[PDB]
Write a structure and sequence with these properties.
It is classed as membrane protein. Keywords: membrane protein, inhibitor complex. Cytochrome bc1 bound to the inhibitor MJM170. The structure is cut from a larger assembly and holds chains A (about 90 residues) and B (about 80 residues). Chain A is of the alpha+beta class and about 90 residues long. Chain A has two helices and one strand. Chain B has about 80 residues and is mostly helical. Chain B has one domain: Single alpha-helices involved in coiled-coils or other helix-helix interfaces (Up-down Bundle), CATH 1.20.5.210. The chains are: A alpha+beta (about 90), B mainly alpha (about 80). Chains A and B meet through strand 1 of A and strand 1 of B. Strand 1 of chain A pairs antiparallel with strand 1 of chain B, so a sheet runs across the interface.
């Protein structure tokens, strides 16, 4: 029930992209997508459309102390820019 | 004796939080005053009675010193 509901919600046309790369003609890919993928639904039931709420970054630490393992692994980071920000470059 | 050579610790996880992210005085009067009282109730019975006993011996000893300093009724009374 959870898997099928997760599928029915999230796996849909406006939320999806069909990519291709190699020796192939854009017209042909579009014909194949029109012939096979146009069967997908195109909007919602007027709700159930989940949109991303922003996530709170918290400066904090987690220290899984385990001397039995041979080498310590450390990962330190500050809050990132997000996909959109030119600063990324 | 250094960080790294202290002792063998295994399977523990410590979750911490930045001091700028968190509060300095979280639930100070709310949770504290009860905790302070609890700590007072724990110790009081062990700590106080000797100081009470000091106070009793103190006031008594000073009282009895002032009694002995002062006059007495047998000093040449019923003896002209």
């Amino acid at each position: 029930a959870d898997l099928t509901e997760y599928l029915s919600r999230h796996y849909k046309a406006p939320r999806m992209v069909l990519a291709a790369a190699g020796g192939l003609e854009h017209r042909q890919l579009l014909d194949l997508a029109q012939k096979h993928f146009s069967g997908l639904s195109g909007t919602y039931d007027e709700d159930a459309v989940p949109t991303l709420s922003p996530c709170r970054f918290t400066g904090s630490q987690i220290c899984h102390r385990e001397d039995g393992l041979p080498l310590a692994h450390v990962a330190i980071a500050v809050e990132g820019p997000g996909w959109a920000h030119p600063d990324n470059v | 004796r250094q960080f790294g050579h202290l002792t063998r610790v295994r399977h523990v996880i410590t979750y911490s939080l930045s001091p700028f992210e968190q509060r300095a005085f979280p639930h100070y009067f709310s949770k504290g005053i009860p905790n302070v009282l609890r700590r007072t109730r724990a110790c009081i019975l062990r700590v106080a009675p000797p100081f009470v006993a000091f106070y009793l011996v103190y006031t008594w000893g000073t009282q009895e010193f002032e009694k002995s300093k002062r006059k007495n009724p047998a000093a040449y009374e019923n003896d002209r």
